[PDB]
XYZ file of C-alpha atoms in Angstrom:
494
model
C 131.896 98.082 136.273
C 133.497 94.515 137.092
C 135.349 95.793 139.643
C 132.443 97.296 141.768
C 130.700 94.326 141.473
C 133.633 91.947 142.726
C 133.813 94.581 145.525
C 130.257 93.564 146.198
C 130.980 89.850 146.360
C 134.089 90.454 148.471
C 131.805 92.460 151.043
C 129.370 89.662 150.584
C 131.797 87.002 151.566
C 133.494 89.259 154.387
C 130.084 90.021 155.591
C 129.286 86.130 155.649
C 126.126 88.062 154.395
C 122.980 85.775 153.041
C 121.798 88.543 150.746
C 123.361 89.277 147.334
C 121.896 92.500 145.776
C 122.987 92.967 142.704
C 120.152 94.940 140.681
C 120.215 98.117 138.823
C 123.845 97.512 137.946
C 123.430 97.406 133.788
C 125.592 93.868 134.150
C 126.257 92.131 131.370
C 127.909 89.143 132.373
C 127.996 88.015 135.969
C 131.628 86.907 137.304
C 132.550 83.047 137.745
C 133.239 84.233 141.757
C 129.948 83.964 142.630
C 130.278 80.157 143.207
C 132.374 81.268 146.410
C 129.526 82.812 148.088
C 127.565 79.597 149.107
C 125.968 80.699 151.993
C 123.553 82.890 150.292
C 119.992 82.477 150.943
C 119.060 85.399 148.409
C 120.293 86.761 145.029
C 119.102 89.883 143.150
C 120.021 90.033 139.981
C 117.153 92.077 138.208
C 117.218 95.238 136.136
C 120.616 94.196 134.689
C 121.713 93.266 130.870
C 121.893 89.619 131.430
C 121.925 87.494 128.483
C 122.807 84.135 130.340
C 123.119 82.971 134.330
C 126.667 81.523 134.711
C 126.424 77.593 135.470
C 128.325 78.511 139.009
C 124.952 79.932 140.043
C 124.107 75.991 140.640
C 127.116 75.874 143.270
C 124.638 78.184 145.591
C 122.955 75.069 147.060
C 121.307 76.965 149.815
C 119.369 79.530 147.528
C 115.673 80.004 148.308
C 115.275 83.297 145.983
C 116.486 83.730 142.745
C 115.268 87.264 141.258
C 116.161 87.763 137.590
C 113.512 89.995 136.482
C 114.547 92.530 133.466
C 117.089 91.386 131.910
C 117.487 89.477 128.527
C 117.436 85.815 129.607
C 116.144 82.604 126.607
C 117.706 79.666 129.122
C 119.266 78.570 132.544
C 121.883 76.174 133.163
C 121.011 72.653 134.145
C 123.330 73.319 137.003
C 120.545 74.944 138.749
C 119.024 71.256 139.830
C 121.430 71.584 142.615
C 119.210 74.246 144.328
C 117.276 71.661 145.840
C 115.977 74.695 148.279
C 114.498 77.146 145.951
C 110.865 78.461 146.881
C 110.785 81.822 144.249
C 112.010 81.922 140.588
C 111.463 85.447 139.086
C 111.561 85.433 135.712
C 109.480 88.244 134.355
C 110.624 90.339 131.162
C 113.139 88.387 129.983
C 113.364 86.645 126.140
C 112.268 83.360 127.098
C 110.269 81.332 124.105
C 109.883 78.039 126.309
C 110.141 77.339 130.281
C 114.011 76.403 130.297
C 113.819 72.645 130.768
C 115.871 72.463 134.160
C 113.055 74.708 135.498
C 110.224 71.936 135.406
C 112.930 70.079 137.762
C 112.663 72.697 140.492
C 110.125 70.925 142.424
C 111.067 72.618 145.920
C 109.480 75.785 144.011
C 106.516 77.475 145.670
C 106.655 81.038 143.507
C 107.091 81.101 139.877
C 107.139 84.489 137.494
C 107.504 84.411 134.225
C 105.612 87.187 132.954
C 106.001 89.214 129.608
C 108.349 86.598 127.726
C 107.470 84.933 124.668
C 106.614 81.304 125.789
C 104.433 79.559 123.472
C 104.156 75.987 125.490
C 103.779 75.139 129.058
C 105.305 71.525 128.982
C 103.072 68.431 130.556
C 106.328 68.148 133.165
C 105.173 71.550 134.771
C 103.297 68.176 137.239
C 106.569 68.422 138.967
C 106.164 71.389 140.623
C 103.539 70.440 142.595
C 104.436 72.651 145.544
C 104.052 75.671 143.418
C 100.982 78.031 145.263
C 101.930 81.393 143.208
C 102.424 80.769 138.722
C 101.743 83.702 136.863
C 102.793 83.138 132.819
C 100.595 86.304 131.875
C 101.182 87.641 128.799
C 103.295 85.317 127.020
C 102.204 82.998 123.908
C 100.302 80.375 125.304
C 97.775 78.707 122.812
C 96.938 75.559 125.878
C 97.462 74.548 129.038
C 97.942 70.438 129.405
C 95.467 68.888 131.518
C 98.624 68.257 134.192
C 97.712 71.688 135.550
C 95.621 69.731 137.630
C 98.530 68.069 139.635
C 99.097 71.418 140.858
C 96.992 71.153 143.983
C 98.393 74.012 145.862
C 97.759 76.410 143.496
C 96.855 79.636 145.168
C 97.145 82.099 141.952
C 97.224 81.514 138.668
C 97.121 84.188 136.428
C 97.290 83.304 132.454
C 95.933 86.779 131.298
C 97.109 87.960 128.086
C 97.411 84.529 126.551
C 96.258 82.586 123.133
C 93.993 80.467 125.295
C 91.022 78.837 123.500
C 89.784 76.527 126.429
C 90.901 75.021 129.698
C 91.219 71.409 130.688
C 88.654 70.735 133.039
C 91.322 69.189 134.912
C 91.876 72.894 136.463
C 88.806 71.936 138.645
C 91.399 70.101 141.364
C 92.751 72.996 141.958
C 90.871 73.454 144.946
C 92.806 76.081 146.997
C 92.964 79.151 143.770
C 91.491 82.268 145.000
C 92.790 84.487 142.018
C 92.720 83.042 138.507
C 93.130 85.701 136.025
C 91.882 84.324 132.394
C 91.661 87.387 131.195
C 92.870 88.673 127.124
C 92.724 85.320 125.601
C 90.186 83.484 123.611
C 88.395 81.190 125.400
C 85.267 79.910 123.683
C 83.546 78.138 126.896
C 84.610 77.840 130.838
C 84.597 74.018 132.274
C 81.906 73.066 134.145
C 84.590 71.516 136.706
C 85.345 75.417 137.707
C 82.609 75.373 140.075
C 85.091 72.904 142.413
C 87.057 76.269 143.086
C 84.852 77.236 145.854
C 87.301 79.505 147.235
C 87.391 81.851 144.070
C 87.650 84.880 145.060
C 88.618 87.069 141.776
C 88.741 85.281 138.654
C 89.522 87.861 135.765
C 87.252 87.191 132.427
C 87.218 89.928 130.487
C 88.019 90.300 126.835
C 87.676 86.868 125.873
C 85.144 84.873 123.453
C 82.845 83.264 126.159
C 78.968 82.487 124.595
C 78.579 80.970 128.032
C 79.155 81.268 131.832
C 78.653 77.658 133.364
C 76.070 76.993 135.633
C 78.319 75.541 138.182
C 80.398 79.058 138.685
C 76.981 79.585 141.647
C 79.117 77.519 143.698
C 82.309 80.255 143.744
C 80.140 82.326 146.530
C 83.429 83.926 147.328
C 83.689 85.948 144.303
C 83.990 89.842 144.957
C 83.084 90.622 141.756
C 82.331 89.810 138.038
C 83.933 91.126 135.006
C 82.482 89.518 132.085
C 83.644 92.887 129.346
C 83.972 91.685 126.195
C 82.553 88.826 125.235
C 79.495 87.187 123.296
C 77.458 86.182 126.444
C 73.577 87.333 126.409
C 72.671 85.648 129.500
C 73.522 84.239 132.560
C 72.918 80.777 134.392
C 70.058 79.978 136.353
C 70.631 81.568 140.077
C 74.014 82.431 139.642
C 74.032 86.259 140.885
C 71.865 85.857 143.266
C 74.374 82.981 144.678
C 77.278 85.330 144.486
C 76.455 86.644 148.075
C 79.287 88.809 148.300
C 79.366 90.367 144.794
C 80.450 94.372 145.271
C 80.331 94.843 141.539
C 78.562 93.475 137.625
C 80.347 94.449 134.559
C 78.249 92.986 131.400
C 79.442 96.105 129.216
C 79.905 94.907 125.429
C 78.464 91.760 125.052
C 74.849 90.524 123.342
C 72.674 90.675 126.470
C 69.111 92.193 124.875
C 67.068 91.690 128.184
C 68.479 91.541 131.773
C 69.784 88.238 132.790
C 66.534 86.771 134.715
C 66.198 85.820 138.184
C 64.564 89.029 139.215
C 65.128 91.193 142.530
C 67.464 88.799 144.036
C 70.921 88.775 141.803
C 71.299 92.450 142.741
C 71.379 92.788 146.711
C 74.974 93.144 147.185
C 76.490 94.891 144.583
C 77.376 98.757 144.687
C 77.689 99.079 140.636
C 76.088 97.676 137.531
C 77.827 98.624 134.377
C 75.656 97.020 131.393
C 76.845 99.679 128.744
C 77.535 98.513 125.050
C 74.653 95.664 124.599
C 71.509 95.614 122.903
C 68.871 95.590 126.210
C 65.808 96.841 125.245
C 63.825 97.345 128.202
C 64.636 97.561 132.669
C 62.628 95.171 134.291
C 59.920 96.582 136.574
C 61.432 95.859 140.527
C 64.702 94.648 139.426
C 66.158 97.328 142.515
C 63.496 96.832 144.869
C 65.933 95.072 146.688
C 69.148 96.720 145.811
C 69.950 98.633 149.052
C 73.386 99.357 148.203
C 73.253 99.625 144.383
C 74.395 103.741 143.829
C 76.063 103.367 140.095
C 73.981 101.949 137.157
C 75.550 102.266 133.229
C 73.389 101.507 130.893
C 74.857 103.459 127.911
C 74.661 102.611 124.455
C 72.289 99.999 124.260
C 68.165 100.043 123.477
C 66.140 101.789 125.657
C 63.387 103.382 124.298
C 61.309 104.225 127.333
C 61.991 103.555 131.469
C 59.699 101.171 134.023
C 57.061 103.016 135.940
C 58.952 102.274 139.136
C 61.911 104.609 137.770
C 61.586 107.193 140.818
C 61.713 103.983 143.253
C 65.632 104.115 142.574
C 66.139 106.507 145.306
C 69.336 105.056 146.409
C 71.105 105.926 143.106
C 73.692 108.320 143.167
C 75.130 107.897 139.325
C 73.209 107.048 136.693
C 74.444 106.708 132.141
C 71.751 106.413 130.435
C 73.464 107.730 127.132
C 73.170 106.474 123.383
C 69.583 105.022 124.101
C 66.088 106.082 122.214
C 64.984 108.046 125.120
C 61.847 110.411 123.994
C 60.974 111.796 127.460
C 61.698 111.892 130.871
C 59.098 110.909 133.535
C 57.959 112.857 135.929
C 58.386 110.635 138.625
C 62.509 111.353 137.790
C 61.636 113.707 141.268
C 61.993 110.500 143.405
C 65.609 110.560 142.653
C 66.783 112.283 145.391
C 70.386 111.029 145.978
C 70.762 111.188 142.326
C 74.361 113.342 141.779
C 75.502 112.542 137.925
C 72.880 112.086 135.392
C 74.031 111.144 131.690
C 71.560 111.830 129.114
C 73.535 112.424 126.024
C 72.242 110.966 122.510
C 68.794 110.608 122.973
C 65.747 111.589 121.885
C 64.521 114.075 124.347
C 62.576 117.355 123.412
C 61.563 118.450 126.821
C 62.004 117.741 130.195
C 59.558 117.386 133.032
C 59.475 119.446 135.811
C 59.982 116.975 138.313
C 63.906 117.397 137.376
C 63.339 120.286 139.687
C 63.463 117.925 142.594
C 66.940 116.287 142.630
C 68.245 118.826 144.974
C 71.507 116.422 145.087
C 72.394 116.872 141.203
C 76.005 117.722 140.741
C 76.253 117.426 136.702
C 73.945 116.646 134.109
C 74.561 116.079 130.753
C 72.047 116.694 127.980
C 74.536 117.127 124.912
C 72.718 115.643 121.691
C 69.177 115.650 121.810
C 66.685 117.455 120.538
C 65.566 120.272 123.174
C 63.549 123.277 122.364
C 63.155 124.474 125.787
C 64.109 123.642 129.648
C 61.605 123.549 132.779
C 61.483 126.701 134.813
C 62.096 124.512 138.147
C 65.610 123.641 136.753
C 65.937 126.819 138.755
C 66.113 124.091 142.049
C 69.212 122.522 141.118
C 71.181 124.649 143.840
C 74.190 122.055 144.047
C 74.045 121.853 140.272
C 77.849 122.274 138.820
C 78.139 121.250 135.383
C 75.406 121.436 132.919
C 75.812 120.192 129.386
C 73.516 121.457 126.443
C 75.802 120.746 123.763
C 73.663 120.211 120.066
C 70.271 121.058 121.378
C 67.619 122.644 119.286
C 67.292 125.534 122.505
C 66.383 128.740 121.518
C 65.702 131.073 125.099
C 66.921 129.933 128.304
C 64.707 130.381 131.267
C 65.330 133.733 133.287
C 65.647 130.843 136.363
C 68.913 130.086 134.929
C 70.668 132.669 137.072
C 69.547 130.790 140.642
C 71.594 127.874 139.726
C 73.785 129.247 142.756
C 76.941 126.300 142.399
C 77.084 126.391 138.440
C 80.771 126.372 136.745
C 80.437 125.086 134.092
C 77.640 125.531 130.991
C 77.729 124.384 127.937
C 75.516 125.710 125.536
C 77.332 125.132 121.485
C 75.839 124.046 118.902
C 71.731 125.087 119.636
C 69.776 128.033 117.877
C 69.902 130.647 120.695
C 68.827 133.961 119.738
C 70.320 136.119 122.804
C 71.108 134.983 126.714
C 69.053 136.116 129.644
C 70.111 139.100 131.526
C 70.112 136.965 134.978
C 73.568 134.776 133.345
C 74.830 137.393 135.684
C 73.951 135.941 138.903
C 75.654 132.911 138.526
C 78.322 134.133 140.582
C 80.419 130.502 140.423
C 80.227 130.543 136.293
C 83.934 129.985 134.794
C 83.256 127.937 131.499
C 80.581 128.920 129.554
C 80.194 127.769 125.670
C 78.546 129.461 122.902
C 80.507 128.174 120.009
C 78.260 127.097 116.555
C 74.623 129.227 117.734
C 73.932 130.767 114.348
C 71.432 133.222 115.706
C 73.721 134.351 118.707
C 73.828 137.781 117.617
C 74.263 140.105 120.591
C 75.731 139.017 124.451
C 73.940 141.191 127.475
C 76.016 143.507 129.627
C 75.644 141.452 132.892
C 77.770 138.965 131.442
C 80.118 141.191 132.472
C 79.252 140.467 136.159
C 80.640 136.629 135.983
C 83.868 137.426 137.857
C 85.275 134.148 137.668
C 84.473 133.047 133.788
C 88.099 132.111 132.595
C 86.276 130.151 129.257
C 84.039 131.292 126.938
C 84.090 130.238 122.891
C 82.094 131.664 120.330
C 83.147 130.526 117.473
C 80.431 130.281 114.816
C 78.263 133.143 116.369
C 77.567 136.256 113.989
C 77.508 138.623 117.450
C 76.571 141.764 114.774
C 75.318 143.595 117.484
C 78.888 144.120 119.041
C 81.089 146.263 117.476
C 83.040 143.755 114.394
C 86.069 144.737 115.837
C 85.497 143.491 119.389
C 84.495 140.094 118.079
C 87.538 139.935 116.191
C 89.338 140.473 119.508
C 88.053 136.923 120.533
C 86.618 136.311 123.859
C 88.462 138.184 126.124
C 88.106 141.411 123.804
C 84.443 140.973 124.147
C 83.718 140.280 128.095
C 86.487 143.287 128.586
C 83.818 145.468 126.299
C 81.026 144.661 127.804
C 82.636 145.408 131.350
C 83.378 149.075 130.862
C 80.387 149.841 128.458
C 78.276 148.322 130.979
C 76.731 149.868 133.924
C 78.607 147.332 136.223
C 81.447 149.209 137.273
């Protein structure tokens, strides 16, 4: 209420306090008293239901943080030119559809925040503010930036995300000192060639844009941690760039054009720990391209053209998870037995029938995921996949299971719908760890074995779709739990 809040400024002004914290307080207009309290060095005024800053706010000369986050701002009172000491403006989620004019005459500011309004125009007066090292206008309305964003010399951050931007003025290239400019959710057609002068780049957020292009010039940005490049129209990347980025801990190329890896060879992957390449049209790995990625344990390549893999596939013995989904794979090679750190292998929607027994060998494998191919049977040696937790049959063409299923000792979780099995083998029972187990949509399903019954800890099991006319009709109209309970005590298991 109004009177808690003038008890606030009287405590203020008995406390000779600098700090004013008025947040959280669902104010709606902010009393004319405040002028009195000119000693403050800092006033919090976010989270409230402001809809205008009283022109007394410019009688607190000695202000060097104004907070005004949250609340429903669309100006500020040229009085505010008397703060000829204010480093931090925050003006995030408000209603503002321009900077307010007095604003571009703060030029003591260092910090400015104005996310999340609905700014269409950043004016070419924002040159004043040349001590500004911190401007984030993410997500507002911004179609262009002028080219006096170069005056802005100490620019630290500058994060435009979530803009209309179709280009930037090379101009941006004096901004030598950015280590974090976030471009990312606009609609920038090209990058200037000047952003290679921002050799301190560090981050520098691309994603979802409309880039054909990466310049040539972004080699010299060896600072960069990592690249982000999602969503765009790029299909290949300027001469010796990656291998420049020396410390590069991550590649994202997912949903762009690329058809063949960007070329350079071994080289542009030594430092990073993850390649995510998912959603493009590559047709074929390069032979080598990890002979010398030491560190490289995460490789997507889902949903793009692969219709076979390099002979040096089982030299990638460093990888630890590995998408190969949505591809036109027809088989497996053998050599898949030099995988040995291997832990998550995605194989869904291909085109595999069988699988080579050199699976047998990744003695790390935690889940693999076969769902949607086109299997009629499984190697005997999958038998070897002791740390082997989830495995995922889903839409096969199986029809027996191997009676090595049951040494899978860690197994939880097996999904076997949609296939044309005509009855489980009796060893399901000694996968002691078994707790989901799907059967849903096999057609020829028509009996379960008693030593189901011996799965203490299955808690899922779905059968929908299976005829099961070997159980009694009224079991199987129980549902699952009717059916594992029958085949307990008409089993010899008890």
């Amino acid at each position: 209420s109004n009177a808690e809040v003038i008890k606030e400024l009287n405590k203020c002004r008995e406390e000779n306090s600098m700090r004013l914290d008025l947040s959280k307080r669902s104010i709606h207009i902010l009393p004319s008293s405040i002028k009195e309290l000119t000693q403050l060095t800092e006033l919090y005024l976010y989270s409230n239901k402001l809809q205008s800053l009283p022109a007394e706010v410019g009688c607190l000369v000695n202000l060097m943080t104004l907070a005004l986050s949250e609340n429903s701002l669309t100006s500020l009172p040229d009085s505010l030119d008397n703060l000829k000491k204010l480093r931090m403006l925050d003006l995030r989620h408000n209603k503002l559809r321009e900077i307010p004019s007095v604003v571009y005459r703060l030029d003591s500011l260092t910090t400015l925040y104005l996310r999340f309004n609905r700014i269409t125009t950043v004016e070419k007066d924002i040159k004043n503010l040349s001590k500004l090292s911190m401007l984030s206008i993410r997500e507002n309305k911004i179609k262009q930036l002028p080219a006096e964003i170069g005056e802005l010399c100490n620019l630290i951050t500058l994060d435009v995300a979530h803009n209309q931007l179709e280009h930037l003025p090379k101009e941006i290239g004096n901004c030598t000192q950015i280590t974090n400019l976030d471009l990312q959710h606009n609609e920038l057609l090209d990058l200037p060639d000047t952003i290679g002068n921002l050799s301190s780049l560090s981050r520098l957020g691309l994603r979802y844009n409309r880039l054909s292009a990466i310049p040539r010039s972004l080699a010299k940005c060896s600072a960069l941690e990592e690249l982000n490049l999602e969503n765009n129209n790029i299909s290949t990347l300027p001469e010796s760039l990656l291998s420049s980025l020396v410390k590069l801990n991550s590649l994202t190329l997912a949903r762009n054009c690329f058809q063949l890896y960007p070329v350079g060879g071994p080289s542009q992957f030594s430092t990073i720990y993850s390649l995510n390449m998912e959603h493009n049209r590559i047709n074929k790995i390069p032979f080598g391209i990890f002979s010398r990625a030491k560190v490289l344990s995460k490789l997507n390549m889902k949903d793009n053209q692969l219709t076979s893999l390099p002979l040096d596939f089982g030299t990638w013995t460093s990888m630890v998870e590995l998408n190969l989904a949505t591809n036109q794979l027809t088989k497996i090679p053998e050599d898949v037995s030099g995988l040995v750190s291997l832990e998550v292998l995605i194989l869904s929607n291909n085109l595999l029938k069988k699988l080579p027994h050199g699976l047998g060998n990744l003695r790390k494998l935690r889940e693999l995921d076969l769902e949607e191919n086109k299997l009629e049977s499984l190697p005997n040696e999958i038998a070897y996949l002791k740390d082997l937790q989830k495995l995922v049959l889903t839409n096969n063409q199986l029809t027996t299971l191997p009676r090595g299923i049951g040494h899978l000792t860690n197994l939880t979780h097996l999904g076997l719908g949609e296939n044309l099995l005509t009855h489980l083998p009796e060893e399901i029972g000694t996968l002691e760890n078994l707790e989901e187990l799907y059967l849903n949509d096999n057609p020829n399903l028509h009996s379960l074995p008693f030593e189901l019954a011996l799965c203490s800890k299955l808690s899922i099991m779905s059968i929908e779709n299976c005829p099961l006319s070997h159980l009694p009709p009224q079991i199987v109209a129980g549902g699952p739990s009717f059916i594992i309970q029958f085949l307990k005590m008409q089993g010899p298991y008890r």
